[PDB]
Design a binder for this molecule. Sequence first.
Ligand SMILES: Nc1ncnc2c1ncn2[C@@H]1O[C@H](COP(=O)(O)OP(=O)(O)OP(=O)(O)O)[C@@H](O)[C@H]1O
Ligand SMILES: Nc1ncnc2c1ncn2[C@@H]1O[C@H](COP(=O)(O)OP(=O)(O)OP(=O)(O)O)[C@@H](O)[C@H]1O
Lengths: 732, 732
Amino acid sequence: VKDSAESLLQDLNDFNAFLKQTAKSRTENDVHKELVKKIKTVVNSAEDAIDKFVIEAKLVYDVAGEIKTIRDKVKEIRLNNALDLQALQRKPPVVEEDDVVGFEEEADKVINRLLGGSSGLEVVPVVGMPGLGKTTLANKIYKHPDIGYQFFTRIWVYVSQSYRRRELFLNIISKFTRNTKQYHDMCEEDLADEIEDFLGKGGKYLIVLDDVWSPDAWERIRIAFPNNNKSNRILLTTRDSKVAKPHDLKFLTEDESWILLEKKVFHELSGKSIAKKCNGLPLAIVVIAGALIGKGKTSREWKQVDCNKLVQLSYDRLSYDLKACFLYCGAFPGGFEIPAWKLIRLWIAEGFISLECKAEDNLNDLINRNLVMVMQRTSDGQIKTCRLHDMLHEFCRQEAMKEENLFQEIFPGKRELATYRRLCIHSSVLEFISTKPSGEHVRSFLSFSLKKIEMPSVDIPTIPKGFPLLRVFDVESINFSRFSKEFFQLYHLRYIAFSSDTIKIIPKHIGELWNIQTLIINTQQRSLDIQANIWNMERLRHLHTNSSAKLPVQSLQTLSTIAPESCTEEVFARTPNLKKLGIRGKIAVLVKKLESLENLKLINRLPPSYIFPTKLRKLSLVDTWNDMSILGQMEHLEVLKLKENGFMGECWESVGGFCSLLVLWIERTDLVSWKASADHFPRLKHLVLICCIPIGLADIRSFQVMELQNSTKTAAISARGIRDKGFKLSIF
Amino acid sequence: VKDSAESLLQDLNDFNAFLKQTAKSRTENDVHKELVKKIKTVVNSAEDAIDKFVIEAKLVYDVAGEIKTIRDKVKEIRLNNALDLQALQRKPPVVEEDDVVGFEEEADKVINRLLGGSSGLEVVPVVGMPGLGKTTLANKIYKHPDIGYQFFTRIWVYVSQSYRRRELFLNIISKFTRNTKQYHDMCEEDLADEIEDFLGKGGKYLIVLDDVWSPDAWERIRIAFPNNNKSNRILLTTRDSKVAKPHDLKFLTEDESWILLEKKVFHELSGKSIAKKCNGLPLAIVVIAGALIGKGKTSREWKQVDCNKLVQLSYDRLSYDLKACFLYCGAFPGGFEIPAWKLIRLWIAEGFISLECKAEDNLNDLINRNLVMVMQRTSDGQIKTCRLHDMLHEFCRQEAMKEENLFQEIFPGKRELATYRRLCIHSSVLEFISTKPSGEHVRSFLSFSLKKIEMPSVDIPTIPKGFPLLRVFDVESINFSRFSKEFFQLYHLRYIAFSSDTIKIIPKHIGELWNIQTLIINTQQRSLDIQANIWNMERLRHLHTNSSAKLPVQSLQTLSTIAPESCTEEVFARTPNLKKLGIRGKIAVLVKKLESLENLKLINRLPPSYIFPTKLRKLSLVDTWNDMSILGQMEHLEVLKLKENGFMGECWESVGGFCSLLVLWIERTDLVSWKASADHFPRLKHLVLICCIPIGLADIRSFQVMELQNSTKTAAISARGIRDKGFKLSIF
Ligand SMILES: Nc1ncnc2c1ncn2[C@@H]1O[C@H](COP(=O)(O)OP(=O)(O)OP(=O)(O)O)[C@@H](O)[C@H]1O
Ligand SMILES: Nc1ncnc2c1ncn2[C@@H]1O[C@H](COP(=O)(O)OP(=O)(O)OP(=O)(O)O)[C@@H](O)[C@H]1O
């Protein structure tokens, strides 16, 4: 059976290489698409069989039969479709010029940015979502009367993914001379020099480089534009934020969306609801208006209404792994606030992806390409939450549900569920669960709902029974009263995330699951006792709990909210690579050996400063004023968060030197008198005071962002005075 | 056998994908055509075998043998014709300039539309049927003396499905300059700008954009035409109505058709009959005249007479499913008024295609492309009936009967009937039935005849016997005295539509057919008792009866003319998705729980307005005046039809406020005095009074269509006065 496993592994590797090769091009051939789907199904079957054999080897007849039948299927596919297997390995946009809604103020903003500045060649980059309207705004600015009056020469160059520098340079030359047959033998650099002479002969010039996709194209084309100490400007529209390094183009409002839809259809509650569902994207409004123009003007045909090639331009530029990472963001429901940490852990568990660094790099790559929107950011600048735009969400859902079978949103029949690979259900979870589903190839069970669900006791073991091959089990919105004997049979589990109301103890049978990477226990009990062999899990990396978990007496990276009785030297000696640590166990009971620790959280007198780790970067104290001199000696502390009565006192005088502090966060304190000088916070950048101000922080060079919340008006006056003395101040 | 069924399903899926791929291109290779026919036959055989196995599993040796032989045939086809399987995956029109008949008034109409209007660039779109004569009319206008005198510049641009913008722009440029070698390096946008200056140098210009097929081409080409506040005009001819959003070109009359045929043949009763059969299409007249010019001028050779590539241009632009939907319209006999609801239900049952929304979208797509003609429209603007033009009817019949075998019109022998898939017989039904036909692969039995046929008792079970695989059974023109035991063996039935004269009860064995989607019972009895398990039919959606059906004590959408004794809470609790409901059961005997209901029909004192459903959009009362104040409180009612003594009274004073009403229909009433004001009908648009007028409706902004019928001349005078005070009034 082992040699059969090796042969099946070789077949699966060749099929995976074929799938990776065919993903480089989109095929419209239906036979090729069907063959690709068949090959993907066989690949999934082979993966499941190999994982089953691996689990049995770690711990057989049915496994052998499955391996034989999958090998036979592979041979049949190779023999039958050999020829198909071998065969499977410029229009500038027309934008609106007459009825442009909402861009009247953004156009003036960009124009005033173009008409003002230094005397050098400056660039005004416009970045935005696919179909946001960057070309429309660039055209409105390009044909504006003020721009035409100020700029003697205006040139519109349409760059794209595919362009020829010689063709572009000869197109630019034709705007100045008609005898372009004299350049048939000059090189592209001589063409650029000729363009430089042409542009320098006149006055100021404005150049619109539309749809720049890489900095390489920008550098190659820029050699034709002189910098002759005149206020020459370049207007650049791009999807990627890297090419702009800007002006982030706005979204249309609800009223503007309705205005655009009404103008496009008619040169109504149903119409207003249709325009509201486009989320301020003019491309969606245009597409839906083109669809509505063909239907009759009847309220019943507009209630039935309640593109794809433009998005594919940026989706086809993603790598093979980044495409699967991007499509997995469509599993989260529409408008959902995706937690970045949860998304990263899910990506690592699904096998798409230190691994955390690569996953954060993938998320930042998706954000830079404007495929993912950021809303919440951490105080230190990291991303906290994100979401997909509704058109991007629809694209991801359609692609991953139809063409890739990455996941299926849920009722499917017994024949349909046998082909599903991942399940995402957030509505009518109990109704689907009561049907007793059974999927032998389902690898993930996702349930992202913000409403808590209590799982009936009679239905407790249905998911571990019907889906025994689960690798990801994210049911943190479902309360599990108890664990059945079938949960411990999920030997393939890598990501487990459950919520509970009465689970005060983790059984030792959890340690029988040696594939666990992330163990998230969201319980409302005050204390939790983890009896499972945490240290015997060789693949465990993160352990998140919201209670005071008590660990039993290398790859581990996070130990969130453990009890201080579990802060022994023996326990900390088993986790040399720990980076984030939290304690929520009556701090008064009590980490030096953790030389890689960066995040520390204590939730409820400070010891000498030499006891705390010297490499700590972020420290947060919750429910625990002159004691801050101990935290001042921390030479590497950069973020300090005080939440929920973290530091209580009346008078605080700044004495210690926070040589590395960048963010100071104080929440729910009784501080009355605070005296400080610029010397005590040399590197301060971020200051947040919520539900709580010496004028010495205006002398700080790095102080640029200050956040204020509800408090006495004297604090608001002090903040306003500090702002008067770019600074960002917000008071609420 | 189950695994054999899965393997056959995989083979059928691959063959279906191949058939979908080859449908994208028309092949003239006879070997390829024969191979495609063979593959289609094998696909049909596999489908029948799989459905037989599914029925048997729901409820065997012969099924296994058939599956074996079909799989062997699939392997043989794959092995023998592998190379053939792998291989299977600009002329502007010349139109008549001398002898153009019938267009003398249409040309003047379009010219007066061109010569009059605003000072902006306006478009006069000419939409029409394939071969209607749009290009001929455009050429007649283009060369008209008045057009030539008024327009200094006239340009004829021939757009088509395949065009190059650079080539078109260089062709337009050549009309102004002969040195076109100076534009060899300018981009298409610079070419459009050059054309803009060329057109703006002179005066008014007329441009004829012939054969525009998509709005994208219109938008791409329009960038070359300036709008310089001169009365510049664009004449556009297209087949699709979407590109015009017009001028619907007329059809030639019978006399004009005969004139054209006589002019074309001779530079007769048989000639007049030939010209009459062209249905006013000049293309058909031209083709038949070219055919007749070769024959001798003998009355016997003209009585023997009693194109295709032009229609294929619009047929090849249809999707794969829309092609089958279009060809199915050719099943209905020539000149037949196809009921839209019946067509949609037939499309859903045949598997071509909520499903009703998609089917209505398909019908509207066919109509917009001018492939289907609309005659009868519902009072609210929906389509009621339609038909195919005789040339499209012939095209659909020929294509679906020869190249696709979609259906066969009927006598065929036992060998020929074994290959037929669908049967359409409307003439000599009894003669064909008496022959005892037997088709093992026939899936549909269509009989669309307007003359009623009584079915002999001895011939009752012949159709369920000879055609046991029936999925669609549309014999609503045939009266069935009783149901034989073979009818209940039609387990594959999805669409059953029969007419009867003495069937007063539906047997419980109908519920044994669980595949039924539409159940139409057209009986002449006053009352009907449905004993079949309607609620056990999980796939049933529509139930249309013309009698007072008595239902027995989710997918259901229509319950037409049920008895009010069947309007219980229990019955209405089983149909939460019902949208259309009718009752014809002595209304005096008696729906709130139906929160999705839109259509309500009561056929024979109103209860308080809070009892009726709040989401009702259309309500019709038949045989049931101050009580209309109850209907006025309906905030969402838009269509109100009163037919056959619906509202009887002498004096009616408008009190209630119809805030949402758009159509008011009153038929066969004794109303004498009617007083109303504009406030009581704020949104009224349509008013119909048949076989039955305050001047307060002229103040209604939305009142644009009023229909009148036979009545006293005082009503006609009132209607004429209202019209005097665009409004559409018709009095008969
Ligand atoms: N403010 C607006 N008013 C009217 N139409 C608009 C507006 N913004 C965009 N559109 C229209 O919606 C579509 C958006 O395409 P556009 O070229 O403006 O987007 P883009 O930002 O350049 O996107 P892409 O990255 O795909 O090039 C076009 O058809 C454009 O005419
Ligand atoms: N009124 C007419 N009198 C004489 N011949 C006509 C008339 N109308 C059309 N024809 C002729 O019949 C044929 C119809 O083709 P025509 O180009 O006029 O149609 P069309 O509306 O442009 O169709 P298509 O959509 O296929 O382009 C041509 O041969 C044309 O010369």
